[PDB]
Write a structure and sequence with these properties.
Elements (H helix, E strand, L loop, with lengths): L5 E2 L22 E2 L30 E3 L7 E3 L36 E2 L24 E2 L2 E2 L1 E3 L3 E3 L8 E2 L56
Antiparallel strand pairs: 1-2, 3-4, 5-10, 6-7, 8-9
Bound molecules: magnesium ion (11 copies).
It binds five RNA strands through strand 1 and strand 2.
RNA sequence: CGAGCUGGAGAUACGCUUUGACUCGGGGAUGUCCGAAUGGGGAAACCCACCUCGUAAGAGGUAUCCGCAAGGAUGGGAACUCAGGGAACUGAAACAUCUCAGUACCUGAAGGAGAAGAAAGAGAAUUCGAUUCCGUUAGUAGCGGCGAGCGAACCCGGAU
RNA sequence: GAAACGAUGACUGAAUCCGCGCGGACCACCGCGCAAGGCUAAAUACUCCCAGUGACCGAUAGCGCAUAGUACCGUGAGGG
RNA sequence: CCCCCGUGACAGGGGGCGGAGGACCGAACCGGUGCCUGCUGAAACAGUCUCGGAUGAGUUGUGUUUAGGAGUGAAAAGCU
RNA sequence: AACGAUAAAAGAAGUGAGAAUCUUCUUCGCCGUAAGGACAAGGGUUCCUGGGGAAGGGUCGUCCGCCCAGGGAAAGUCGGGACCUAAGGUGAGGCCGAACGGCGCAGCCGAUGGACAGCAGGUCAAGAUUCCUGCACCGAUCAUGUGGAGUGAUGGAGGGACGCAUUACGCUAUCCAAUGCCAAGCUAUGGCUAUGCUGGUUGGUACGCUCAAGGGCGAUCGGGUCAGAAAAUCUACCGGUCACAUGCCUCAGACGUAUCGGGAGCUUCCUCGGAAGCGAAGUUGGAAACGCGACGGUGCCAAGAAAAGCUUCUAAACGUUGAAACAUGAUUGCCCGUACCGCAAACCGACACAGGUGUCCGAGUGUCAAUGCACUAAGGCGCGCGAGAGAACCCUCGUUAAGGAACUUUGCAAUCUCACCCCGUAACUUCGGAAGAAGGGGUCCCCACGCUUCGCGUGGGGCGCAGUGAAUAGGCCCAGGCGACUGUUUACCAAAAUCACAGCACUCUGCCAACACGAACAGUGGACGUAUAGGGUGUGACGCCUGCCCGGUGCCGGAAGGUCAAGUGGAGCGGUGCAAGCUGCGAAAUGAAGCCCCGGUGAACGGCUAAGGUAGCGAAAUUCCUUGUCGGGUAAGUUCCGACCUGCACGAAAGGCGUAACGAUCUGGGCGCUGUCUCAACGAGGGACUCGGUGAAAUU
RNA sequence: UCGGGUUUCUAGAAACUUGGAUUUCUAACCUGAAAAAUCACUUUCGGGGACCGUGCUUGGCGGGUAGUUUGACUGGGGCGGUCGCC
């Protein structure tokens, strides 16, 4: 049904020319307003109304209704149901995703929608079904395993939502025929090999080759 | 001024003049609309509003920057002037230094001219005496892949 | 370059009175002048503009124009 | 999604029904394959016959944005 | 030479100095999803009327889109603006910048989107939802009366906000049929006399217990503060009570009544021809939208403007005796565009140019269907030199004896094929395809009968050489290379074996990310994305796969030691002076990133001494000798296929070997059928030749 | 804590110091949530914080770009040979 969002708009560059190569497809995707802080709410439950799939992301977002009679979208994690509910704030018991900080949080307690700076909403493991693993508590900072396979410090003043996401993992997704791309991306990359001395470093020759392996520009 | 005038254009018709026209000189009053343009909008000259006065018709104000305020300023001028920024072909019989050149052009500020100006100096006589210009000194002194080539100043005579 | 002085960007950063600057490395003696305040006629430049003059042209010359930046080309800047 | 059959693990196959698809043929439309014609042309790139795409990575309008060593480019140094 | 498309004319009459060409009439031909008609863009008066004939019009010209004067265009409701916002453009304060200047929230500007009140006809030579007529609707301001109480923000919320594909039912436009109905008269050539033939056969408004699909529907009390900044008698959320159906609300539209138009044609005059006035009928059945009922049904994923208008809630605020509202009249009604051309002699193309140009309407017959093909209505038009001749030669056509690819570089070219229906249909395979494989048969008319008819099937007869009897309308096959595939490219010599592609892999980036644009600790794109995400490179479905060498280059790491800048800092030497001092040069030490150096990585550069080619393929689009040798097909085969292998100079992601399917791809072969050829003939049309009119060019 | 210097009270003790590092803290500086979008402020504030970054200078890397260079003889040009002296 989708609802109460905004309108996006294709565009691949500013104050002039093409910056990030390619991309221009589209299909008028609107933007739904989310929430990655989940704090001015701290204290009330809400009925996960539904899990409306929404573009831009790839994370079956979830619809919530916090008692006040207000509305909000949430990165439906990995397992909430047709109307399961949830509260929020330190007085939160690490259940199916919650608006809880970090110290009060268990070890190796996979979560997500995590954060990088007190408030300033999420900013980590918010995609596909990325699972941020926790580890050691420290002074105030913690020890975490970001999807990357990295160990970064961060402190508890930075909320997070229980467990990982999923969106089933873009798996059986194979795209298919060129164009499933155009279904979004664009002019799928041009090989600087089949280009010209003129346009790219790899260019020239008379058959095929390599020599140096550099990127566009140098 | 003194007897024509009724714009080039010359064409028909009506007409104005010594009760002084016309032309000429010199101040006024009218002057829409656009354009710095400023009420607001805008594809220049077109659309649209508000306040104040007002019989209607109609009249004035409504940009911004400085400044209590009075008052000043935004734009425009052919070349000339000072500043900010600053090429290359070209020459070196090839080329990077150098040359062309601080030339071309851009930009800014102002004027009728500017800029520069009252020696913390020139310069060797214990001399001179603000700055600008011309003559000459001098193609010297000196700079220079010491190549190509570039090149002052005091002194002295004048403009003032 | 032995290279003074002026100049300014970054750093530092003195004296005020037998004080200070300079006189082309640097020191002495010698001499010259006094900075971190301002102002300033005149001669000099140019020529859109006016007058006068010319061993200047006199209509393929002279200004592009005996007038037109018009006609005409160009999306245009521009040319003409 | 509805039924039929089955039998060794088998899948499966059958009648219903539904309406998928850089699917099929073809006009518009969009291309431009081969031949001939044209070559001081009807035309500074075309005509006839012939041919490809045709719900798509489709075709197109208005508005607007991107530019010179720069843009743009399903990439020829192509177009600007 | 040419006179701008091979859509053809012909006569009569007229005008006039003068006519192949101007007007008129009557024949003819051409177009008819257009060569008809309506906007928009764009042009400007080309429009109309009266004149003209120099130049412009490829000849003429009495004519013109040309020359001249005059006229011609009319809106409260159509478009736009006085309303709205999108990309983008701007922009008080604010962020950056040698200058000029680049940014940038709000706000403002900005359609091609939203939003909003008129419909039927009439008519100047030339305009019409704009003028007239007929009735209507909209805001506004006013009065009259009803009402008798609130009204209700730059503010809240609701709402306006919308994708693609497919599709059920109702219908309207629109079209068709008929011994429906009205109108008019004639018919003869042999027949018919009317059951023939021709034309017309309704729109606006208003009322109607008529018919009616389809479409739209919760309400209300109360509660919870933590939500709408605030308030809220609204919204959001929570909970109790009655809602299958119905129940409502609503009608697309049909019918009837009435009224207003219009309506085949009819009457008189006509200054020569328009003008004026009159008026019949309105049937039954069938077809039928890409439009209307609408914000319908369903499925799908690649997930679908914003704002105001608008309903509602209140803060403020006014008054609660003359409100909000309703009705009835009264008054009001701004600016710009409104002619004509408009797929085209009136726009872009130097030209009255065979080109280009967005959207809408776009009839009938026949043909499964259609916006196709043939004819044709309406409507438009016969392309602005013309007339003879009937040679060569050239262009575009029709036929062709015997032969049938012998042509040739090659079957290039042109024939054959060609539609629907029934039968039938292989190798191979990713099981979907290959498949319209191949091959074969049928198709016309009539009568009867059976079927659901427009029509089809069963059967009997019929005519022709011939029955999609006209027009549209796949020739097929085997074998191989190259790329898997739809796609894309060299506007004006290359469409392909290019580019792209799904998929694979390397690699880098934790967020002010890498990366990129930029004068700029400005702004911004990546992304309102956060690692199953973003960049760069290379490889190119799927299949089995991906070998050996880190010496040299590049990268990541290690990281003792060697080397190395500025600077800190020290000996030391030296110049001048009487001295303090002032002063030239200065050195060991200490001082980074890298560089040396140690180690590693090949879907890194890359080689096959750092090492030597696993699988696989091999004379290959990479072979030189070479027409390799033998086998295949031919009578005969430099090329093609098969194998072998002595791989000049095959090789595993510049990927290797394969691969159903696909290809305006290239190579070889076969069947068919041909004028490609033996070898050309005849015939047509358009030039060429002749005469009259106008009259180039390169060149010299 | 490591560097040393200065001054005093006895190499130590004390103090004044002036440096490197580690760490730590934080008014500058930075940056994020809120009623008032970019910005200024109020503060919860939150966290970063002497780093980054901006300015001057140092040396490295730098076909990303720029300016350029790349001889002559030559029975044609390149390849080969050659170009001075006896
Ligand atoms: Mg003369
Ligand atoms: Mg002139
Ligand atoms: Mg066809
Ligand atoms: Mg903005
Ligand atoms: Mg003829
Ligand atoms: Mg004869
Ligand atoms: Mg075909
Ligand atoms: Mg291909
Ligand atoms: Mg293709
Ligand atoms: Mg270079
Ligand atoms: Mg060489």
């Amino acid at each position: 049904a989708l609802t109460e969002a905004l309108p996006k708009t294709g565009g691949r560059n500013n104050r002039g020319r093409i910056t990030s190569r390619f991309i221009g497809g589209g299909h008028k995707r609107l933007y739904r307003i989310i929430d990655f802080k989940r704090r001015d709410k701290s204290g009330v439950n809400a009925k996960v109304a539904a899990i409306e799939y929404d573009p831009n992301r790839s994370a079956r977002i979830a619809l919530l209704h916090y008692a006040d009679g207000e509305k909000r979208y949430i990165l439906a994690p990995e397992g909430l149901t047709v109307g399961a509910t949830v509260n929020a704030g330190p007085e939160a018991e690490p259940k199916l995703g919650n608006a809880l900080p970090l110290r009060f949080v268990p070890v190796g307690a996979v979560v997500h929608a995590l954060e990088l700076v007190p408030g300033k909403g999420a900013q980590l493991a918010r995609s596909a079904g990325t699972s941020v693993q926790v580890q050691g508590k420290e002074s105030d900072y913690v020890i975490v395993r970001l999807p990357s396979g990295e160990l970064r410090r961060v402190h508890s003043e930075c909320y997070a939502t229980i467990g990982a996401v999923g969106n089933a993992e873009h798996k059986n997704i194979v795209l298919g025929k060129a164009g499933r791309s155009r279904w979004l991306g664009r002019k799928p990359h041009q090989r600087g090999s089949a280009m010209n001395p003129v346009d790219h470093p790899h260019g020239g020759g008379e058959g095929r080759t390599g020599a140096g392996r550099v990127p566009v520009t140098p």
